[PDB]
Amino acid sequence: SIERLGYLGFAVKDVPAWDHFLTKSVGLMAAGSAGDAALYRADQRAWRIAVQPGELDDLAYAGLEVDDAAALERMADKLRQAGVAFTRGDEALMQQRKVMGLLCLQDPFGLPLEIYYGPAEIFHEPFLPSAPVSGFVTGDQGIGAFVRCVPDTAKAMAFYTEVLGFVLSDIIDIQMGPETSVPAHFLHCNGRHHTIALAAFPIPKRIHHFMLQANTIDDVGYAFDRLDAAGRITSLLGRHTNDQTLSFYADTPSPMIEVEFGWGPRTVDSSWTVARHSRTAMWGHKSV
Amino acid sequence: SIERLGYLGFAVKDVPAWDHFLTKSVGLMAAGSAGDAALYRADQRAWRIAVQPGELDDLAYAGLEVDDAAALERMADKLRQAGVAFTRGDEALMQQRKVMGLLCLQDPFGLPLEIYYGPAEIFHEPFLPSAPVSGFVTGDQGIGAFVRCVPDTAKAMAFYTEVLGFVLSDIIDIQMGPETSVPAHFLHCNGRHHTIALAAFPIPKRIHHFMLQANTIDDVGYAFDRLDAAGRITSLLGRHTNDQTLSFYADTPSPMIEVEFGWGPRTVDSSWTVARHSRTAMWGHKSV
Amino acid sequence: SIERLGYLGFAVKDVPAWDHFLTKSVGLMAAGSAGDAALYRADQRAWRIAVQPGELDDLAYAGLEVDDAAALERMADKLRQAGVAFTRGDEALMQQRKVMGLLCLQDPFGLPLEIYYGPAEIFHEPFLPSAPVSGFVTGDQGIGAFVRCVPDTAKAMAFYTEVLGFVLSDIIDIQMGPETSVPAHFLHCNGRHHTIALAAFPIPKRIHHFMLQANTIDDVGYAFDRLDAAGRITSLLGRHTNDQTLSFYADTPSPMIEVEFGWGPRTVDSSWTVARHSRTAMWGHKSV
Amino acid sequence: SIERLGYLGFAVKDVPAWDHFLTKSVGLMAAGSAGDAALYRADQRAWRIAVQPGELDDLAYAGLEVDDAAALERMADKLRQAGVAFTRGDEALMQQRKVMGLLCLQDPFGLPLEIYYGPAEIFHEPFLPSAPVSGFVTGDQGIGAFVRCVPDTAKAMAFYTEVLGFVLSDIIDIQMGPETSVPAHFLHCNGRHHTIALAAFPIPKRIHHFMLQANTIDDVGYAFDRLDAAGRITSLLGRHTNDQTLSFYADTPSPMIEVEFGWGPRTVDSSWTVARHSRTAMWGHKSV
Amino acid sequence: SIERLGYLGFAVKDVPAWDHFLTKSVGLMAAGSAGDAALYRADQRAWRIAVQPGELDDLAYAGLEVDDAAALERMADKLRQAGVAFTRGDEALMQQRKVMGLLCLQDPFGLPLEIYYGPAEIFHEPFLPSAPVSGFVTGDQGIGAFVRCVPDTAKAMAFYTEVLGFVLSDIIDIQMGPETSVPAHFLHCNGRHHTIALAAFPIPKRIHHFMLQANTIDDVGYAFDRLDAAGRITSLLGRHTNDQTLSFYADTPSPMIEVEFGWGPRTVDSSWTVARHSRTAMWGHKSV
Amino acid sequence: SIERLGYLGFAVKDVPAWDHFLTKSVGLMAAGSAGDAALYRADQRAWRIAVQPGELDDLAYAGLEVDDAAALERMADKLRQAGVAFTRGDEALMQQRKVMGLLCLQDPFGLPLEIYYGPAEIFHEPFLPSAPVSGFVTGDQGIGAFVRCVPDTAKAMAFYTEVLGFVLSDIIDIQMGPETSVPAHFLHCNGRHHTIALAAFPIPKRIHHFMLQANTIDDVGYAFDRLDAAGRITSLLGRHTNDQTLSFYADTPSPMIEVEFGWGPRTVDSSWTVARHSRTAMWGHKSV
Ligand SMILES: Oc1cccc(-c2ccccc2)c1O
Numbered sequence A, B, C, D, E, F: 001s002i003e004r005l006g007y008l009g010f011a012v013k014d015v016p017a018w019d020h021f022l023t024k025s026v027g028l029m030a031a032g033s034a035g036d037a038a039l040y041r042a043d044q045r046a047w048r049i050a051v052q053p054g055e056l057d058d059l060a061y062a063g064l065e066v067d068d069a070a071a072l073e074r075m076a077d078k079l080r081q082a083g084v085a086f087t088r089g090d091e092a093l094m095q096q097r098k099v100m101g102l103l104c105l106q107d108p109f110g111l112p113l114e115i116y117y118g119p120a121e122i123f124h125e126p127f128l129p130s131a132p133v134s135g136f137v138t139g140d141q142g143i144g145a146f147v148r149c150v151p152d153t154a155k156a157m158a159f160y161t162e163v164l165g166f167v168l169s170d171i172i173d174i175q176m177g178p179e180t181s182v183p184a185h186f187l188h189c190n191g192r193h194h195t196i197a198l199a200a201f202p203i204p205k206r207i208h209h210f211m212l213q214a215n216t217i218d219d220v221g222y223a224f225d226r227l228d229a230a231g232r233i234t235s236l237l238g239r240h241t242n243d244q245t246l247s248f249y250a251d252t253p254s255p256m257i258e259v260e261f262g263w264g265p266r267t268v269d270s271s272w273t274v275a276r277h278s279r280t281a282m283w284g285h286k287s288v
């Protein structure tokens, strides 16, 4: 099964705005380019987020990591057994992503996924944030998470769990209207409470938002002010019911896609019990 | 197998007395109602104890928790293989218990059991005790425990261990008379030394008592005084031989059913060794 | 010198509103009454805040604590040497405040101060909050702090430091207007970064606000929502430059008097270095 | 497999001398009698060492513990498969040993072994040493260990490992003469470095000695003086090469059987590596 | 007495080279300007190092910090008693240095010293390094240290100890030639092993070098490479005999003035014993 | 599979030079001889490195350890299944190596390997270094590591992983020339990041170097100076990208074979993720 989320690639209409957003506001480290994609770092990996020009204004692909070559072949085997179409990346692609091997596929609703192993690290160019943030929590929990919009949760669920090996952490009934809610399913593939959540939201984007976890509460506090000066805040500070992440949300330059910048969540294991929650926030997160 | 005891439902003749008892004396948080049952909280769960009017004056049902949907199906499979009759709860029942799924059955002697998954949590309504108690120890150890009265221990043992997957912790020969004792069997399904004990007591109740574990010794000390002012004490403070729980006992408003309020026991694991004890108390617990 | 701030008494136009405010919103424990004052608890002390009817809608007095009888006499001596008028409380007053001895005086601008020793504690009636808050940080740091409005800071400074023995922690230039700021002086008399701050604010109240410190960040988060539902929020969450308290502000029912509810500040000692800051917030605290 | 050594029974010519030896010198707690055997305690177990009159002046039996009934049946199965004769203890024997079940057998050279489960504990009669010793290290590591004399190590090895499930920790070539040594094999069945060692010593006793482990170095130091006043010392203080136990040896009242009283050894696990040592002592243990 | 070294001001011929040096190589944060001085930050202080154009190519002044106003007056008193000339800084100077008060003087050999209190902090503009360094160790130990060149050590010693209140930590005989050494005197005024060292070196600069202490060994390792790429290394990594600082040295753009970038030294207290060392390095520090 | 690297044997032209090198410079303890091999100790093992005269000036053999006899037979079985030729060491060889059993084979390119169990320990002759080093990190991680030169990495990889059970940790592309690099494969068989690395280097030696890990950074610092006085340094201090070992390199007396003396690396487990690095050093290690 997938070990963790390692990278995200976006295709956007305003690359300079995304560049400023990811460096001056979020704190990521600019790390040159690959092909027509600008690269950004959060840690020792050569890159974690990629931004390229495109009319999509959306997540273009997501990289799903394994630990070694054999594990990648085993994932190939699973995709074959499941009837999911995939192609092995060629040399050019491998060089572009800076990986030792990869399989290209899509989830049931068109999101390109790239399962890989052997990512590049550059400890000789130590991470340097572009804005005041002490660092991010990644490591074995990967880069962070994202919330995937789907038309059919059950269908999405079967694919992510049965095929990719993710596991349901919990469910929240997200209130949409007076008498309307969406059952969001939070899935883990490691100690991070969730790496991918699935929800049938009525938005025209592949994802509702992506999430990065910073080292300290102050990291989060300072970032809020940075995004507020930029006029991008969508929620006040808050804390979630299910994962206990303390965060705020903000708009990216791509309409309808947000970012969540948080701290201090609960982690999980095999002993995690599926439960249901009626609210996303234990406190805070009022919309603005 | 069952992961933990999650809830208890009582059917009683004096609902107001039980309400006062569970809030002002024990410290539970009143949490509205469901159907004709009043609900009480000990933690983040939407409810842990339910009280409804009834001539029984006894435990009406007990909820046995699993971690996810698949585990529930696996329990279904075990019940089928064992020939134990059961029915899947309907929507109405699921809504009443605030669970995502359940199987209704009885143990060999008529106690209704409800095996479930996906309980409701409401972290947005943080627990607030009705009396001075810093909190209860629950989490993965569930709500607490109870001691089940049975006519045939061996028979009860086979069901709880072979069918529900509980495990014998130890046995105590409880002195009844000058030359009379009952071999009580203490069973675990997690780190709590026991969640259910089985004993052939000569009382006309399904259970001898239920037990809640508080965070501090002072929690226990203060509760004793609360129950003493209420005239409900049945034992002085004491400490058990087998689990090292430090507690006292008191009567509930249902005749012959007691509650045990304790602190600081030993926990268990796979390395737990079955042993036999000749007394329930290492010290204290004198009857009053 | 004064060891800590032990209690506050307010005189207000809407006692029921203050009662609801201090219990349902802040979380204090109602603790009966003394004279025409309603009493509220935050810990083991018999009372910490007192509310009585009055047209003032302001702080009526503040109790400044010492450790023993001799220390109280020594404070008497200091007041004599300094020419500050004072009167020893009579039996009736002592009984009302539940103290073993006290001296009544005023600061240079009319705020009644009561220096006392031997406060009453009632550990047999353990603290029980009226709203979800795990507890407050008091002990040797006293009940909390307040910010005192003064017409003459230098004059106020000389009295609090030279006479009462407080010590300057630091100064912040609080921006009032485009080119206008007030140099607020933060003073300590123990490990709490400040117990009293002095500032020449243009408001018609003795104090700008009082501050209570809760045990956890969640305590603060939950309280914000409680005060927001009440429509009382004046600032978003934030963190101070000087003390690192993480808090929010809200209106009390007395116009122009706020409360600050915070967590996790820096403490001080003899090695504290006076410094100057140009902003009150390191992050957050935007006015609303 | 066997989980730990739980008890030892000796048959001796001088019961009063053994009584004084185990209480006044070693520090064990006298715990009445069972049949014609006097019982001694080291902890919460009803008994750990038994002494009965007999011309043997030797170890009469050793009790090998399991964790539950099923494990005992599984050991029965193993003995059957291996062709080792055994008999299930009758009620009388079970009552005498205070166990819930047992199998009686002998090792290849005549030492009676008793495999059991469900030992009696009496926490209501807390352990009280007869001499100054803070306590013994037992628990999951059992009572201690012993060194078994055998004519054929290989043969003894096959039985203890293949049949009883013990595991080789290491081997020491114990120098007997100028050019003569005995390869002693140290075996574990839990965290205790060894519970049984096997050695082809030329003595006319089933065991060379038994070993108890005390809580502190001072416990050991004080015991030495106690045994020296009794004239029983056979070795000076020392520390072993293989287990790092710091101890001294002394004669019991049964000729050629010694006791080892030690402290602070290394524990083991699955990652333990078999090694060979040329001396028993890293330092000390000179014979006297 | 002086509490710590708070800031340094240099007057140099190549301001752009110093700017690049302090940001890209050392890792300091550029923090605008004051007068014709460019400012650099290492922590929460508004500034720690100042660089202005000048033919000196040397340390122009050093700021010596106290904790409050009274302490500053007490230092004034000491200077008066000692006959050392000084002037109180005017408003303009105070504004330039961002301090609440200061006294301007020189040491016996012309180095301008500025004793101050009430420095400015700007926690609302959190420190952001210009190069990969996790942070510096400052706080109560001040910015770091420097080694002061003097023609007369005894004379310099009397001034720094008797007048400014520094204390001798230890002495090292620094080998100059085959049979030539300089007795360097290392002085502390807080927990930092030394803040100022005095030595009769034959160089035409006020100081031999200044020293900054980074949080980690990696910080130091990475900086070495940064300075080596710049061609500025003067010593290999090493560790000092007296303070145990692990560091390397490099040239600044001002000829004959170096910088020392280190980690992990010993701290001191009242119990520090004066000792003498014959070498500066316990290991490493070979000149290059 | 192999548990760890236990010993190394070299065949050299200058035995006295190797003796001085391993004792006075590295710090190993001379431990007599076996056959025509001089023995050296790093810990409690009777020997860890052996040096014998020979024209090879290279690694003559390497000992690969298991935990017990059965494991050795299991390795025999694996070699048989794989078609790798091997011979069981005779008594003489066993006595020479001081082991209880061994299998002699070669890797695909001629390096003799000796898989063994039951090594000799001599705790009665506690380790005493010949030079100032507090000790080495060995234990379950074995003696250290080495980098093996191979003509065919893929071929070498298949043997070490599939046959001996080593596991790939990571890969580094070691820059050889302007546009030339060698993909070195770092393999583990325990917690040590690597025990054997494989690389297609163009040198006429079986190994590029062997590595020992000391207890402290000072151990490493002092050793550097020792080797520098001997004129043997090949690299400055540095820290690796993949294992985070902080070390320096030096020449042994055998041309083209170096030694690496390091400290403080990362350890591994099952959760280790294969990654790729473009440099060997995160910092330092400049060649000299
Ligand atoms: O981390 C998280 C935890 C719980 C809920 C959300 C969520 C909130 C709004 C929309 C979608 C998800 C989230 O990001």
Ligand SMILES: Oc1cccc(-c2ccccc2)c1O
Binding pocket: B147, B172, B184, B197, B208, B211, B240, B241, B242, B243, B245, B260, B280
């Ligand atoms: O927790 C417990 C541990 C040991 C015994 C009891 C017990 C005592 C009296 C009647 C039944 C059981 C108990 O609750």
Ligand SMILES: Oc1cccc(-c2ccccc2)c1O
Binding pocket: C147, C172, C184, C197, C208, C211, C240, C241, C242, C243, C245, C260, C280
């Ligand atoms: O705790 C505090 C720390 C720093 C500033 C304030 C403050 C803010 C606004 C008005 C007055 C004081 C405060 O309460």
Ligand SMILES: Oc1cccc(-c2ccccc2)c1O
Binding pocket: D147, D172, D184, D197, D208, D211, D240, D241, D242, D243, D245, D260, D280
């Ligand atoms: O614990 C131990 C560890 C190592 C050796 C012995 C030993 C010494 C002499 C005779 C037999 C065994 C022992 O008891």
Ligand SMILES: Oc1cccc(-c2ccccc2)c1O
Binding pocket: E147, E172, E184, E197, E208, E211, E240, E241, E242, E243, E245, E260, E280
């Ligand atoms: O921190 C330090 C500790 C000991 C010596 C020096 C030193 C070395 C060379 C010249 C002057 C001083 C130093 O900076």
Ligand SMILES: Oc1cccc(-c2ccccc2)c1O
Binding pocket: F147, F172, F184, F197, F208, F211, F240, F241, F242, F243, F245, F260, F280
């Ligand atoms: O421990 C290590 C970690 C990473 C690389 C090397 C290495 C460097 C040069 C040549 C071969 C290997 C090494 O020893």
